[PDB]
mmCIF file of C-alpha atoms and ligand atoms in Angstrom:
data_model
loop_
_atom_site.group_PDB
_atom_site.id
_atom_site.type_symbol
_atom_site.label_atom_id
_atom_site.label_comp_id
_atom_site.label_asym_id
_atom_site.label_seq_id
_atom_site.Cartn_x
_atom_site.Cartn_y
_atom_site.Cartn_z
ATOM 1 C CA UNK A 1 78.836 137.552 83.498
ATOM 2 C CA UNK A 2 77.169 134.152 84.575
ATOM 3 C CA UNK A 3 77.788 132.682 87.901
ATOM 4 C CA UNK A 4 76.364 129.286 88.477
ATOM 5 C CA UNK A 5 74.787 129.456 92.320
ATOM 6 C CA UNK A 6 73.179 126.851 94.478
ATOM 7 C CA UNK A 7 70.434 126.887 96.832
ATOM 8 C CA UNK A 8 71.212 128.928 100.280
ATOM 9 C CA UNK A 9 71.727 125.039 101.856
ATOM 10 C CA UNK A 10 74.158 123.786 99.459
ATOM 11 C CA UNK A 11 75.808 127.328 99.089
ATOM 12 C CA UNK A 12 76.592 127.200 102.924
ATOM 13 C CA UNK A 13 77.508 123.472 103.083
ATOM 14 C CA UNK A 14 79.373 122.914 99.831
ATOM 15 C CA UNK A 15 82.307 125.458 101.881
ATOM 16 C CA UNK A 16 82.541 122.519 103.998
ATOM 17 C CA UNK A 17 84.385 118.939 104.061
ATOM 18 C CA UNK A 18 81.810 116.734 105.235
ATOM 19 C CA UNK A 19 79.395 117.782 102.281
ATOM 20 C CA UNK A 20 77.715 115.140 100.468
ATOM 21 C CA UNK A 21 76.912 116.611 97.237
ATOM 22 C CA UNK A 22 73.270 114.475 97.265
ATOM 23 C CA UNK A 23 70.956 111.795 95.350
ATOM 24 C CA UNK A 24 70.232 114.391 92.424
ATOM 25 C CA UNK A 25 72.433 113.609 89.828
ATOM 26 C CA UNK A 26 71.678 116.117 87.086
ATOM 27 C CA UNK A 27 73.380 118.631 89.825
ATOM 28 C CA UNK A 28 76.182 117.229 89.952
ATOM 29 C CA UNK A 29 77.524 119.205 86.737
ATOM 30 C CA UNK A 30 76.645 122.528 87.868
ATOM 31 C CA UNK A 31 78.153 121.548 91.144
ATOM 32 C CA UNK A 32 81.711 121.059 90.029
ATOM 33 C CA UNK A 33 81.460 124.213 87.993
ATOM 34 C CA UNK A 34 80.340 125.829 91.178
ATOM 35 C CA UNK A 35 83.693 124.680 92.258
ATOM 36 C CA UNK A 36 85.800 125.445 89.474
ATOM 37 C CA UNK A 37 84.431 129.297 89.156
ATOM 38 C CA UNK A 38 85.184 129.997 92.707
ATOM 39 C CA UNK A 39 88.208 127.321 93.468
ATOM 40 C CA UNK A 40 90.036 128.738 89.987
ATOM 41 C CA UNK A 41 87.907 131.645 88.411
ATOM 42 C CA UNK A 42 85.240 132.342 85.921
ATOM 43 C CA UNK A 43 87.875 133.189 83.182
ATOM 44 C CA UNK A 44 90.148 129.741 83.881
ATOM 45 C CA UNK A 45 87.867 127.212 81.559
ATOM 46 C CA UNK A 46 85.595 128.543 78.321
ATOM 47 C CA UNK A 47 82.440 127.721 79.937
ATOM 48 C CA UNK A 48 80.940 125.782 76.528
ATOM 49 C CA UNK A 49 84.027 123.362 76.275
ATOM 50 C CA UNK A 50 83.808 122.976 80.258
ATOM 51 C CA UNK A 51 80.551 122.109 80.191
ATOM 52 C CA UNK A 52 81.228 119.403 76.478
ATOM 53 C CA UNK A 53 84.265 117.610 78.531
ATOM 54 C CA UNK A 54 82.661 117.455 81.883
ATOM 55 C CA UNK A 55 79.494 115.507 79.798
ATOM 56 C CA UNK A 56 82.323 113.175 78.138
ATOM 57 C CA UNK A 57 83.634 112.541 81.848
ATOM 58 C CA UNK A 58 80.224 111.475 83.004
ATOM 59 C CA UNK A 59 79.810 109.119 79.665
ATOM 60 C CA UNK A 60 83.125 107.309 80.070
ATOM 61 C CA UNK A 61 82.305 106.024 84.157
ATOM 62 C CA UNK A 62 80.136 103.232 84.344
ATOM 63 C CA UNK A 63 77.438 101.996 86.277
ATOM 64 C CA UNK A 64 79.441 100.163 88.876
ATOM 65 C CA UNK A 65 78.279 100.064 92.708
ATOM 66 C CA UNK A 66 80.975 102.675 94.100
ATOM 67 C CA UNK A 67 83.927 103.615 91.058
ATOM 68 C CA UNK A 68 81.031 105.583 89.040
ATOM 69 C CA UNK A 69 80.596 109.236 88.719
ATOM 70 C CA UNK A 70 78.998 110.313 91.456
ATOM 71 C CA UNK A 71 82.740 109.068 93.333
ATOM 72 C CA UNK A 72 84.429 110.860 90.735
ATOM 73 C CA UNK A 73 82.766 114.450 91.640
ATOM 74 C CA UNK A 74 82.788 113.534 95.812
ATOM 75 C CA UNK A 75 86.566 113.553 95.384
ATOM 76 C CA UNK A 76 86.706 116.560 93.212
ATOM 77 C CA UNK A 77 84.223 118.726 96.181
ATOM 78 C CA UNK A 78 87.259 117.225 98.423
ATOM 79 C CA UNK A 79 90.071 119.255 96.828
ATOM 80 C CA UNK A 80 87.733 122.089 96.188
ATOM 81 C CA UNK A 81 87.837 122.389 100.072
ATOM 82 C CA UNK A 82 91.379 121.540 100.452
ATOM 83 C CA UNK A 83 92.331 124.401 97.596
ATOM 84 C CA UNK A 84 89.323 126.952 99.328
ATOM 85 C CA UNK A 85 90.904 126.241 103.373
ATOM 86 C CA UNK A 86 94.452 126.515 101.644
ATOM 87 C CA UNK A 87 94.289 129.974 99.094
ATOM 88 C CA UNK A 88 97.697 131.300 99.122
ATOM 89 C CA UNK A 89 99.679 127.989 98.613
ATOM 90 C CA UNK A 90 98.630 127.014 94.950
ATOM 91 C CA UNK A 91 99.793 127.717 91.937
ATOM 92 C CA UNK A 92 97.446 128.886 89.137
ATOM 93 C CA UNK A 93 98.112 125.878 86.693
ATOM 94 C CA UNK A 94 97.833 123.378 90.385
ATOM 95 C CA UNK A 95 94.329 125.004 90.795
ATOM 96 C CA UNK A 96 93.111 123.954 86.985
ATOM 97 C CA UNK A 97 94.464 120.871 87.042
ATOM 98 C CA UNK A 98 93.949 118.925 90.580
ATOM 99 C CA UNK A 99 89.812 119.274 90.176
ATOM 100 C CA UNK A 100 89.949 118.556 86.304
ATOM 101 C CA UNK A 101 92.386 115.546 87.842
ATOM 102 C CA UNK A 102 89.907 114.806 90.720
ATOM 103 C CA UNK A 103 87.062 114.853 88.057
ATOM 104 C CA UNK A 104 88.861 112.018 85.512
ATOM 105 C CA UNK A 105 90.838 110.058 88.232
ATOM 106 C CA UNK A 106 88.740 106.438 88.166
ATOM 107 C CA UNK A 107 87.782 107.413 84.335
ATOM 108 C CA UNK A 108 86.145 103.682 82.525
ATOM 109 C CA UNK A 109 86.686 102.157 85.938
ATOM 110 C CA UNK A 110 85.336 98.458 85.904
ATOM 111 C CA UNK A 111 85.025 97.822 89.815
ATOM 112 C CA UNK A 112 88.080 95.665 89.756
ATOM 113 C CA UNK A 113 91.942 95.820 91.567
ATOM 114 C CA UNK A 114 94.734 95.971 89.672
ATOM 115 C CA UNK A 115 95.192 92.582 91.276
ATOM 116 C CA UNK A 116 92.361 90.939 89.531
ATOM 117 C CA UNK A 117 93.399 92.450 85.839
ATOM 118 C CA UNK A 118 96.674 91.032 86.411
ATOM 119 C CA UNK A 119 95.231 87.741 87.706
ATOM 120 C CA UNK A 120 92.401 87.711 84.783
ATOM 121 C CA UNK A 121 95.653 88.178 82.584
ATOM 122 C CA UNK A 122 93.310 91.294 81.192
ATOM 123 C CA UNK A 123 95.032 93.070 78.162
ATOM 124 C CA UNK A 124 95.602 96.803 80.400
ATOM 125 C CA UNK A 125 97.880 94.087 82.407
ATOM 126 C CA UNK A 126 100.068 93.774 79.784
ATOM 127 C CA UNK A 127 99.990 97.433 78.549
ATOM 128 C CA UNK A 128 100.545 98.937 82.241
ATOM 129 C CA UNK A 129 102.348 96.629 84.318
ATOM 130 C CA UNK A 130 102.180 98.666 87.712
ATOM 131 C CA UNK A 131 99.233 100.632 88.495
ATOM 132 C CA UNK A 132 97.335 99.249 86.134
ATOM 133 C CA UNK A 133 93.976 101.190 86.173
ATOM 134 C CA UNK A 134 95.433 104.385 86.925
ATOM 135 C CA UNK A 135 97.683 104.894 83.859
ATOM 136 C CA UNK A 136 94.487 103.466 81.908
ATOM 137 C CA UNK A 137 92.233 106.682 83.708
ATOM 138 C CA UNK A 138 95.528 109.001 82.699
ATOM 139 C CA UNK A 139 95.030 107.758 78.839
ATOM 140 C CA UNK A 140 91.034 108.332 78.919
ATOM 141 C CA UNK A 141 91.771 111.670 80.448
ATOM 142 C CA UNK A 142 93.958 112.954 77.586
ATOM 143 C CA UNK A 143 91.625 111.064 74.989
ATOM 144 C CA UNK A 144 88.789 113.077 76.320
ATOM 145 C CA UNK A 145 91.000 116.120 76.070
ATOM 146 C CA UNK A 146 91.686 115.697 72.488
ATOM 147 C CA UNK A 147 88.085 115.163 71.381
ATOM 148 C CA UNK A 148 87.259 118.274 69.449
ATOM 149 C CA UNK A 149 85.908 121.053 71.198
ATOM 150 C CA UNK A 150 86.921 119.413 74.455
ATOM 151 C CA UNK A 151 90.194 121.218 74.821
ATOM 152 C CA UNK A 152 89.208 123.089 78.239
ATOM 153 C CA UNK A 153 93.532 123.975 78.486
ATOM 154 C CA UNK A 154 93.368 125.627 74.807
ATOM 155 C CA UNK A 155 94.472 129.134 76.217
ATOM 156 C CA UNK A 156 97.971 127.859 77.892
ATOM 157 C CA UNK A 157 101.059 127.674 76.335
ATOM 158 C CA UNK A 158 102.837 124.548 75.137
ATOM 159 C CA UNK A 159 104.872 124.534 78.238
ATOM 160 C CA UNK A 160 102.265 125.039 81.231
ATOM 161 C CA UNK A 161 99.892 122.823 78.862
ATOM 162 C CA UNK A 162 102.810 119.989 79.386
ATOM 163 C CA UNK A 163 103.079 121.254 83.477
ATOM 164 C CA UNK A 164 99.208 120.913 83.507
ATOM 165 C CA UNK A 165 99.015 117.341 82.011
ATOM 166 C CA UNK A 166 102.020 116.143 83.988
ATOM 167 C CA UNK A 167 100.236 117.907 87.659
ATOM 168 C CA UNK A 168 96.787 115.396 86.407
ATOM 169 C CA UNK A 169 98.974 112.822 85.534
ATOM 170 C CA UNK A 170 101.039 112.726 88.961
ATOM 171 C CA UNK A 171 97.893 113.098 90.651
ATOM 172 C CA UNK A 172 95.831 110.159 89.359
ATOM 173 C CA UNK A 173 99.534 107.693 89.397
ATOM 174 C CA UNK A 174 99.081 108.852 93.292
ATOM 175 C CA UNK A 175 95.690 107.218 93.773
ATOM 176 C CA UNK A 176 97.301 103.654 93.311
ATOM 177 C CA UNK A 177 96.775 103.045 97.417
ATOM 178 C CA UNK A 178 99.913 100.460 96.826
ATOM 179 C CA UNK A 179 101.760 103.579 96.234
ATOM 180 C CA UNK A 180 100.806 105.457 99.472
ATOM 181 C CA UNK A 181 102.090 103.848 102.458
ATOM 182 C CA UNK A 182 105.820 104.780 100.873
ATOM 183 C CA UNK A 183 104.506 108.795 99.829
ATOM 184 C CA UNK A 184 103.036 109.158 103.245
ATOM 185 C CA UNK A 185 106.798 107.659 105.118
ATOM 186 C CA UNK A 186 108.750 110.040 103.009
ATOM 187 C CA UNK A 187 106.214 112.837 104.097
ATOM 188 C CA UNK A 188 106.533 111.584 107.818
ATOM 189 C CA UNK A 189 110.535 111.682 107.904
ATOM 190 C CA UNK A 190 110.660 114.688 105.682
ATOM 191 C CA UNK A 191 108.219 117.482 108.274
ATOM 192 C CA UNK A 192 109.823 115.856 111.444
ATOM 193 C CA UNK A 193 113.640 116.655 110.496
ATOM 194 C CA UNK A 194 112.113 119.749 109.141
ATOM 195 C CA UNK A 195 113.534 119.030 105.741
ATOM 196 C CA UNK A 196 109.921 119.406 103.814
ATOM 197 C CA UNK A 197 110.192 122.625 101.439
ATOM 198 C CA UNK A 198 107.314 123.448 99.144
ATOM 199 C CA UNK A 199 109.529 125.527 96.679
ATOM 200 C CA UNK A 200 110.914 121.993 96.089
ATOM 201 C CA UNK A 201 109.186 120.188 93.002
ATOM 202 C CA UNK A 202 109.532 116.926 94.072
ATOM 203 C CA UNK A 203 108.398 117.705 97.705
ATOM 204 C CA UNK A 204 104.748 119.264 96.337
ATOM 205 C CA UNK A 205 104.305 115.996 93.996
ATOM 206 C CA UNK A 206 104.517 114.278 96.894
ATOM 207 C CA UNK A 207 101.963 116.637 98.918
ATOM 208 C CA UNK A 208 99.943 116.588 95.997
ATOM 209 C CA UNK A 209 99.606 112.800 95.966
ATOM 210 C CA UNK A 210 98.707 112.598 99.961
ATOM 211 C CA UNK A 211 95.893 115.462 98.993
ATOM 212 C CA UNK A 212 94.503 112.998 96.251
ATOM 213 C CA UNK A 213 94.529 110.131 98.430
ATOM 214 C CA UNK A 214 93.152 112.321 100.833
ATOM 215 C CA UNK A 215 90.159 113.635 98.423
ATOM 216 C CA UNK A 216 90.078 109.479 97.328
ATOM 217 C CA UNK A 217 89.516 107.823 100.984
ATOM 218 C CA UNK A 218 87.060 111.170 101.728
ATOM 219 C CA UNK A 219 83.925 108.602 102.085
ATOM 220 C CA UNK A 220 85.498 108.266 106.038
ATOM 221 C CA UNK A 221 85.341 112.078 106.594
ATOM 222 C CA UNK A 222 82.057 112.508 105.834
ATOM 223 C CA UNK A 223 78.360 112.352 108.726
ATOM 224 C CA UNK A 224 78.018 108.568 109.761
ATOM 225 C CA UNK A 225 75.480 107.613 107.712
ATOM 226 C CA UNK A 226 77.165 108.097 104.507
ATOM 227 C CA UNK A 227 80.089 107.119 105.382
ATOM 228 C CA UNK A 228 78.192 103.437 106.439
ATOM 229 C CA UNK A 229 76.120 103.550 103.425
ATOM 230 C CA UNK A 230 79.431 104.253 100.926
ATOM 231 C CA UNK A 231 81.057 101.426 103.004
ATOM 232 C CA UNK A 232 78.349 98.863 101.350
ATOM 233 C CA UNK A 233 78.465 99.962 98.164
ATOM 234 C CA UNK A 234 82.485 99.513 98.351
ATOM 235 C CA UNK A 235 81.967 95.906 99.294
ATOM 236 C CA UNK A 236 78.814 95.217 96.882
ATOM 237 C CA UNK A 237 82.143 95.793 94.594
ATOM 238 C CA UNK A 238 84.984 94.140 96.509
ATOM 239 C CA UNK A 239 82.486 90.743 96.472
ATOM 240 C CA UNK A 240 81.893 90.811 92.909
ATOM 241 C CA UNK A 241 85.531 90.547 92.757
ATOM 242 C CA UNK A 242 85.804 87.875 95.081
ATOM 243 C CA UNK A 243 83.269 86.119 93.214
ATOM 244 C CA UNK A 244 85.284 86.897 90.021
ATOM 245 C CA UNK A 245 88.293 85.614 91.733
ATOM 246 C CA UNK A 246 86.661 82.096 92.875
ATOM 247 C CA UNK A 247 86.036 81.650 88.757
ATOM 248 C CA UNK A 248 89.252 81.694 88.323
ATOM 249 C CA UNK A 249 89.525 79.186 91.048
ATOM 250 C CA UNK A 250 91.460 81.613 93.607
ATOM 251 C CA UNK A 251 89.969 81.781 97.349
ATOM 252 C CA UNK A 252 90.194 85.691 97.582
ATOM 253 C CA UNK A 253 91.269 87.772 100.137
ATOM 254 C CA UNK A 254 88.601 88.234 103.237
ATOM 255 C CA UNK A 255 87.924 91.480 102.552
ATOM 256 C CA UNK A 256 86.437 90.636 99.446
ATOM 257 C CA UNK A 257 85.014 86.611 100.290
ATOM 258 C CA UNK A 258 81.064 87.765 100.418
ATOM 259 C CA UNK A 259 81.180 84.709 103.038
ATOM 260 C CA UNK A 260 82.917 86.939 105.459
ATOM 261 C CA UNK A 261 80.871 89.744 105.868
ATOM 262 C CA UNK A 262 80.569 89.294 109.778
ATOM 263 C CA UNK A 263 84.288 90.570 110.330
ATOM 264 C CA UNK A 264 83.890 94.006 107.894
ATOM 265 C CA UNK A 265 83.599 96.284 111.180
ATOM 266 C CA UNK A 266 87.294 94.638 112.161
ATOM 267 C CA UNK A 267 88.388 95.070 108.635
ATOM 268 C CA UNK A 268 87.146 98.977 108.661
ATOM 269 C CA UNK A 269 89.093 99.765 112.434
ATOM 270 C CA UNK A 270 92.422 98.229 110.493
ATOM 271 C CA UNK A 271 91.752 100.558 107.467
ATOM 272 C CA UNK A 272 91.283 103.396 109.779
ATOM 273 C CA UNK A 273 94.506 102.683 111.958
ATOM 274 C CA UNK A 274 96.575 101.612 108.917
ATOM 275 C CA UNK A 275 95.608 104.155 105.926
ATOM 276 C CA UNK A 276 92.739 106.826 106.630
ATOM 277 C CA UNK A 277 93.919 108.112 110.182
ATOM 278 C CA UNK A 278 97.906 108.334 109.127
ATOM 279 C CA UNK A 279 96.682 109.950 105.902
ATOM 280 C CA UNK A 280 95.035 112.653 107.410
ATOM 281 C CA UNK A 281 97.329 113.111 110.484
ATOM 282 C CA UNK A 282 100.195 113.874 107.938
ATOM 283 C CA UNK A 283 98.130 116.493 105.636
ATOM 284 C CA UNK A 284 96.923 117.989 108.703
ATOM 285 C CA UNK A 285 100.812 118.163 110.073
ATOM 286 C CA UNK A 286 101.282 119.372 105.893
ATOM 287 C CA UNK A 287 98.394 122.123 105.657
ATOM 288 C CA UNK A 288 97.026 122.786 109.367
ATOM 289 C CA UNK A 289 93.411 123.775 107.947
ATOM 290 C CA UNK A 290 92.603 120.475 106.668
ATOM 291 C CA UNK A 291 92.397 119.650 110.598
ATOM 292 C CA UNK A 292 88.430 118.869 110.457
ATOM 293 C CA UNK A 293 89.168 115.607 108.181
ATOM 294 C CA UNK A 294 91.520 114.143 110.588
ATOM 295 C CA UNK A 295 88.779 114.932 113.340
ATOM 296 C CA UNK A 296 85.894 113.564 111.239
ATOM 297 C CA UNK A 297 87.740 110.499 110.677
ATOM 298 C CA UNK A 298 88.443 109.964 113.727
ATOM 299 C CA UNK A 299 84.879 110.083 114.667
ATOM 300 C CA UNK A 300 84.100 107.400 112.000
ATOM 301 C CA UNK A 301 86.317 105.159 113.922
ATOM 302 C CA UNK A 302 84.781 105.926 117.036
ATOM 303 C CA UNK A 303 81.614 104.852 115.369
ATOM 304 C CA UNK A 304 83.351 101.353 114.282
ATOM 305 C CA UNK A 305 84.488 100.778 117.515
ATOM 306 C CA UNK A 306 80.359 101.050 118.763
ATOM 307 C CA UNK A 307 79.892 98.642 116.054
ATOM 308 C CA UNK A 308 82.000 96.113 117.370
ATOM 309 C CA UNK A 309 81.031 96.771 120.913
ATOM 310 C CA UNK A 310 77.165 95.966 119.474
ATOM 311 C CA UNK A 311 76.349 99.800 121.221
ATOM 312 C CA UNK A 312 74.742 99.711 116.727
HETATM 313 C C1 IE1 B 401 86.373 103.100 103.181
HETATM 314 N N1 IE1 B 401 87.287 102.846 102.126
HETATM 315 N N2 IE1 B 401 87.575 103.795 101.284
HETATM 316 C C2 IE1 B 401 88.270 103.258 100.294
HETATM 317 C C3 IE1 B 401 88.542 101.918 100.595
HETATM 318 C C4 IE1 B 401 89.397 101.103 99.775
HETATM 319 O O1 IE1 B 401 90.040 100.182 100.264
HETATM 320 N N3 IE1 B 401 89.502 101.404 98.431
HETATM 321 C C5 IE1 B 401 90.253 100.628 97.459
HETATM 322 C C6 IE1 B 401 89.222 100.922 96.383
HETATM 323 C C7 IE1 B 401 88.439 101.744 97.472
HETATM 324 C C8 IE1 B 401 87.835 101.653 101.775
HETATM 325 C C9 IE1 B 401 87.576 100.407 102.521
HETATM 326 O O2 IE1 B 401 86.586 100.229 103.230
HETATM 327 N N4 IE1 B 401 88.496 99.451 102.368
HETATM 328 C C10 IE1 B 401 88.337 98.202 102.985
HETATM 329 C C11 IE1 B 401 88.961 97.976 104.350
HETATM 330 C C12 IE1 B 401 88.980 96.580 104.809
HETATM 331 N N5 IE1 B 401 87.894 95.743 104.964
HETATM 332 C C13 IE1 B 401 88.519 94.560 105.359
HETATM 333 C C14 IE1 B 401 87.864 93.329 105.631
HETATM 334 C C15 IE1 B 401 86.498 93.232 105.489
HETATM 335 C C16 IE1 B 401 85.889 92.020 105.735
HETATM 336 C C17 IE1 B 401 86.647 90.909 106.108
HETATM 337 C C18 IE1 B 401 88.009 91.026 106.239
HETATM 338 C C19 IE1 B 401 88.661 92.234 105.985
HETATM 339 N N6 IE1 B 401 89.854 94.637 105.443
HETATM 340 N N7 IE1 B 401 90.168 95.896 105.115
HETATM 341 C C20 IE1 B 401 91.504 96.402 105.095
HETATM 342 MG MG1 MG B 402 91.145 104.540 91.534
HETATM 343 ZN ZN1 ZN B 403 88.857 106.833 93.396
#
């Protein structure tokens, strides 16, 4: 019979996708539970191992500018409003899994590309040749899993247990951004000849992945002023790379050459046209509530655009 609740701010705001769940850290727990009790139910998780594997999940991000825990639970309060604006079109086991996979998907995250792993000739290169960090944040998810007393799935059978692990598993392959430009063309063609059917398995894995990379990119959806102050500490990490990269004697890319800082407001109006705006266009098309993403981004470009225009 207990609820976790929130103060009457965050109680109102939480309900909404712009929320930024805040600078107070120890909340952040009873935040996602928040989420889980009301997104999934009181009786889907046995509150004691909920509360042992969400503490496991904090202990295995690191202390990186941007790929740290506080990113991992800003993604998960994404999907909890995705799942909330959506009820009816969910499955029971898609409910438990997509915040659990939310939760775990940058898990031991170092602050580097797949790129520079395969470049460094680092040994998760060798063990996962394509989407390199991603299969390694599957494997700490299911490690964490097995840790005793951490089984949070205990009460499922064999075969929804496997259906779980393979929904979390789809859903954190889907945050490789390599693998999104394809997912969101086969999305495109599929609505527009009217061929997109959600009783098809293949069709929601692929709806599925544009909702994580929806939940992932959800730093552009959010007031101004995070979204500008998430954009630095996503570059504090892109030029660590870059400085990584000249080591190795490799100019990097731009976008992560410290040196080039002046041209990041270009950079971000490419990113916006390219990825975030046709990402949220499409779920919008996909699920009509998730409209207010699509219009928030859209005012973070606008903001860009004054940026460039020196107007701030
Ligand atoms: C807001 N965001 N969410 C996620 C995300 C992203 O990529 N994730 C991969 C891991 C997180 C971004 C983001 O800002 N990405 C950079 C966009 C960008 N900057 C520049 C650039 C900058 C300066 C000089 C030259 C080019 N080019 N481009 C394309
Ligand atoms: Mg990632
Ligand atoms: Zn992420």
């Amino acid at each position: 019979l207990m609820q976790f609740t929130l103060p009457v701010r965050l109680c109102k705001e939480i309900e909404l996708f712009h929320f930024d769940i805040g600078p107070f850290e120890n909340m952040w727990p009873g935040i996602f539970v928040y989420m889980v009790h009301r997104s999934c139910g009181t009786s889907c998780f046995e509150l004691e191992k909920l509360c042992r594997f969400i503490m496991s999940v904090k202990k295995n991000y690191r202390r990186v500018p941007y790929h740290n825990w506080k990113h991992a639970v800003t993604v998960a309060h994404c999907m909890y409003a995705i799942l909330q604006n959506n009820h009816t079109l969910f499955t029971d086991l898609e409910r438990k899994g997509l915040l659990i996979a939310c939760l775990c998907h940058d898990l031991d995250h170092r602050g580097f590309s797949n790129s520079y792993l395969q470049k460094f000739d680092h040994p998760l290169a060798a063990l996962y040749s394509t989407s390199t960090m991603e299969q390694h944040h599957f494997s700490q998810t299911v490690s964490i899993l097995q840790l005793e007393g951490h089984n949070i799935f205990s009460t499922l059978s064999s075969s929804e247990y496997e259906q779980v692990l393979e929904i979390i598993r789809k859903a954190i392959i889907a945050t490789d951004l390599a693998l999104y430009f394809g997912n969101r063309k086969q999305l495109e063609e599929m609505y527009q000849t009217g061929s997109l059917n959600l009783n098809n398995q293949s069709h929601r894995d692929r709806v599925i992945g544009l909702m994580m990379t929806a939940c992932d990119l959800c730093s552009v959806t959010k007031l101004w002023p995070v979204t500008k102050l998430t954009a630095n500490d996503i570059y504090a990490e892109f030029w660590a790379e870059g400085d990584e990269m000249k080591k190795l004697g490799i100019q990097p890319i731009p976008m992560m050459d410290r040196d080039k800082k002046d041209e990041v407001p270009q950079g971000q109006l490419g990113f916006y046209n390219a990825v975030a705006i046709p990402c949220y266009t499409t779920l919008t098309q996909i699920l009509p509530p998730t409209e207010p993403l699509l219009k928030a981004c859209r005012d973070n470009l606008s903001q860009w655009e004054k940026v460039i225009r020196g107007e701030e």
